[PDB]
Amino acid sequence: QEVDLTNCDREPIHIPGAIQPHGVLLVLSEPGLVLTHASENAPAVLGNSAEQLLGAPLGHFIEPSVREPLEADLRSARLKQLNPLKVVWRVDGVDRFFDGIAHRHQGRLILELEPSSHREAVPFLSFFHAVRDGLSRLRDARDLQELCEAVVQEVRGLTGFDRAIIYRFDAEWNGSVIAEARDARADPYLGLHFPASDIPRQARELYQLNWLRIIPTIDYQPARVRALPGHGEPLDLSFSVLRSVSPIHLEYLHNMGVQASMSISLMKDGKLWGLISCHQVSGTRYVPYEVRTACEFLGEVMSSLLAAKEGNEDYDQRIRAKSIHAALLERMAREVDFVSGLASQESGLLELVHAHGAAIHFHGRTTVLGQAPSDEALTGLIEWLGSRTGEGVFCTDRLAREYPEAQAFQEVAAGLMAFSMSRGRNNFVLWFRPEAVQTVNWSGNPTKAVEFDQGGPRLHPRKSFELWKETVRGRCLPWKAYEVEAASELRRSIIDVALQRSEEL
Amino acid sequence: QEVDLTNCDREPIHIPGAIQPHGVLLVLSEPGLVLTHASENAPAVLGNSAEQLLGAPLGHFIEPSVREPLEADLRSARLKQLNPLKVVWRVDGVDRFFDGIAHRHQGRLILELEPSSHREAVPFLSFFHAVRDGLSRLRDARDLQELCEAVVQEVRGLTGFDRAIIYRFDAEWNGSVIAEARDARADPYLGLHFPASDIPRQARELYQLNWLRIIPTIDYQPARVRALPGHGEPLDLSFSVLRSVSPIHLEYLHNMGVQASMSISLMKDGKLWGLISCHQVSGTRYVPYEVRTACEFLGEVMSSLLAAKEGNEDYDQRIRAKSIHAALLERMAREVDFVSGLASQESGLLELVHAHGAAIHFHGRTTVLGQAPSDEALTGLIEWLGSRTGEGVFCTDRLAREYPEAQAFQEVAAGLMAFSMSRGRNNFVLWFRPEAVQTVNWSGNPTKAVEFDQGGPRLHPRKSFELWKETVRGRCLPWKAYEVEAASELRRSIIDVALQRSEEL
Ligand SMILES: */C=C\C1=C(C)C(=O)N/C1=C\c1[nH]c(Cc2[nH]c(/C=C3\NC(=O)C(C=C)=C3C)c(C)c2CCC(=O)O)c(CCC(=O)O)c1C
Ligand SMILES: */C=C\C1=C(C)C(=O)N/C1=C\c1[nH]c(Cc2[nH]c(/C=C3\NC(=O)C(C=C)=C3C)c(C)c2CCC(=O)O)c(CCC(=O)O)c1C
């Protein structure tokens, strides 16, 4: 079944029927540009009832000389490049002005309007340095930590947020604030780890598709979006800038001492790698669209630069694991008994994967070798592998995750990377790896990252985000990239020499 | 010695002692202050004669308010993240504005001054949107062809050049134009080839380190970099944007019929993989530095994606290969004699790498499937050793090159995709491709270019650039890398079942 969701990971955050009400969301028939949905905050923002708007066509509302460029663009298929649209809305005789942000999703033409006149606004000059020098900084970064600290310093400067951090996910979707720029007010989260549940699975998948979100104030009544009959099905809002956010995450931000936020998905190889997260500890922050997408852009630049700087690499060992491998291959090549030819290679075989223990099961007939004992316990380990898959190279940093019968062993302090030699799948190779104990600095108590109501099943976020030092056992140090090719390569060589052996009969 | 350099790889293009006169090059003593070199075109660009500039501090000519922010910047360690410098030059009592491009090379601090236009909100927004729309368009590129396509369209859109092409180097450092954006006006260079003497080694070694060069006009007068007594030794100008370029290359551009030029290096795996190259056919192109580097950054993103996007080339052919593989790995299951399992789907094994012939030598006997060399195919079956396989897949379209006897049968196998199955190297799988006449469109006879003066001992580039077809003989259609890959995966699949068979008997 693979994975494996929980109570958070089920909420449907993409169709709440409601938008954040500092702006107005509409959807327009194509090609009529007739309004089928409007949001009930329309009189507060545009000066019209919802009633008035529905079934009416957009051109009726717009000051007559900007009808042509707006309508032309709304039917353009190159629209995502055209945001923001200049929107002048005329009631009676007087004008108001909006950032129009149009998009299409699941066959709907959605248009959101952000009041753009009486504005926060940012001077062009710091908008100019943030994207021009921003670009220059990320390009000149010498390592990942310069890349990160350039991003947050630049986002903070351009937004004037109280806090801005780089948040990096891990293989289990825990996260960790690995860089930060802040005003002295806000408490520093630099160093903290957060549970994978602060950004649950449906959120995470959304932010892989939509890369930009802002909550300008966490205190608002949602504006319901009306529609006229024939469109009662809840409208998809994945890509709506104004979508109402999961109110329990509003609760979360409350307990985190933060009154506004903005985040930006960071992407590597197509999956979510981390966030740019920004916080205002007190005060709303209604950041104009233009400033946001400049922030999104520094995001997309930093993402694309990950590999070319996160690849500070490890430019040896690889070469020598290649050289260790050559050695093990040449020795196996030469004994008629190559299982005993690899077990005579205790140090070359342990050091290939940086394992501190190994075991070889073949025609019977286990031969342990390193220091990871089990032996009585290991016969249950090995053809537990024999059951439902251990193909190709099995690899884990916490064997007590997949086979918690290891909890009682030395644990994944006797740490496993394995495979089978023949696909008749009963000849195995194991590797074992000692513990890394590691103190880990958590925000609040991960044990209890979620609270429950009265007497009530509804969930709530933790009230405490203060440093809480867990110590972690089971886990050892990560199996690096180069360690699992080395394992498949040695698998490839066992297969070759076995095949050569039998060609010799 | 490797290369082996005809009559061009001498001319130290890095020390010409002259620049392109649309800008002014300066050299600055350090710590701070005082001008040791300066180009003679100062008065025409800048106001002052070099005689007045030389020996004096930079401040003396900088408008006083601008003076300290700028000399704080010229003292930074990483000037790169500050370019362009805002240089406000006060002459008489009028302020002329320049882009200050600063760097250090060989303990010498070099300030080039290019005339600047003062930025303004609206045209910056459109530029920023273009760079940002270019950046994502490359990330969303399906394959190399598309990556190349988006790149040339995006560079042209920013620079307004008449032609932007992707020039791709092959193995002898010849070239090919593999994609092009252009004003249909200009004659289309798409598909042409250009000999490696057009970009000599010390040019490419230069461009391996400096990824951006522009010649805003070919017809121009090298303003010489004059200096102070005690500084008269050649100035290393390898990283200067104004460094006057080798004058034989300007006649090349003249002869080629190009008035202005811009090129950007492309880097795969540390080595020069190609250029982005741009021309103006008549008229000039003084591209501002901000736009120039934004093009360079798209080049850096393109470099960063070459492997990934090329790895997804022919992404239907791959589907079709993988299901042919799948098909072959099953029909080898119902037969203990896997060899004839591959001889039933001889049409499948032949379509797997698009060959018209194949051969399996297994346990001393050879099975022939398509059109093959004569039954003396003991031919290249015995002959081999150094390279040859060793392992894994041997792949050529010039089998007459390495293995000369095949000239007799290039009508049926001028190309050879082959591997061995075991370390004993008695068993092989061979695929054949016939000769294909093939014609290669050069850019005027590439036998010349290695050209002399009167013929006095001077060098000179070709005169005609008309399509000059070469009819290459003795090759098959080139072997695609998804085909080489398909042979790799079959080869180890054949191993896996070669074991499993013998292994259990
Ligand atoms: C199971 C319920 C939840 C618990 C318990 C919890 O803690 N979060 C739950 C659900 C939830 N979270 C979000 C959105 C979200 N969460 C974060 C988390 C962090 N912000 C930070 O700054 C840090 C560390 C520095 C962490 C960790 C973030 C950034 C976001 C995105 C919104 C934002 O920027 O504030 C959602 C979805 C909200 C939505 O998209 O509607 C849910 C359901
Ligand atoms: C023996 C000397 C030379 C012969 C013969 C010749 O043909 N060129 C010689 C010297 C030379 N060229 C350059 C720089 C250079 N050349 C090119 C070539 C091309 N531009 C195109 O668009 C195409 C085809 C599509 C080709 C081929 C390019 C791109 C460059 C880079 C400069 C530019 O973009 O205009 C040099 C070095 C000059 C210098 O860097 O100072 C030399 C010595």
Residue numbers in the entry:
A (entry chain B), B (entry chain A): 11 to 515
What is written in the article reporting this PDB entry?
Phytochromes are red-light photoreceptors found in various plants and microorganisms. S. aurantiaca contains two previously uncharacterized bacteriophytochromes (BphPs) denoted SaBphP1 and SaBphP2, which may be responsible for the light-stimulated growth of multicellular fruiting bodies. The classical BphPs switch between a red absorbing state denoted Pr (λmax ≃ 700 nm) and a far-red absorbing state denoted Pfr (λmax ≃ 750 nm).
In order to understand the role of the unusual Thr289 in signal transduction in SaBphP1, we replaced it with a His so that the T289H variant SaBphP1 resembles classical BphPs. The mutant PCM also crystallizes in the dark in the Pr state in P3221 with three subunits denoted A, B and C in the asymmetric unit, but the PCM-wt crystallized in space group C2 with a single, dimeric BphP molecule in the asymmetric unit. In the mutant PCM crystals, subunits A and B form a non-crystallographic dimer, and the third subunit, C, is related to its mate through a crystallographic twofold symmetry. Interestingly, the crystallization conditions for the PCM wild-type and T289H mutant are the same, yet they crystallize in different space groups. This already suggests that the mutation affects the relative domain orientation. Indeed, the r.m.s.d. between the T289H mutant and wild-type PCM is ∼3 Å overall. As shown in Fig. 5(b) and Table 2, the PAS and GAF domains superimpose well, but the PHY domains occupy different positions. PHY displacements between the wild-type and T289H mutant are on the order of 4 Å. It demonstrates how tightly the PHY domain is coupled to the structural state of the BV chromophore and its immediate environment, a coupling that is essential to a signaling protein.
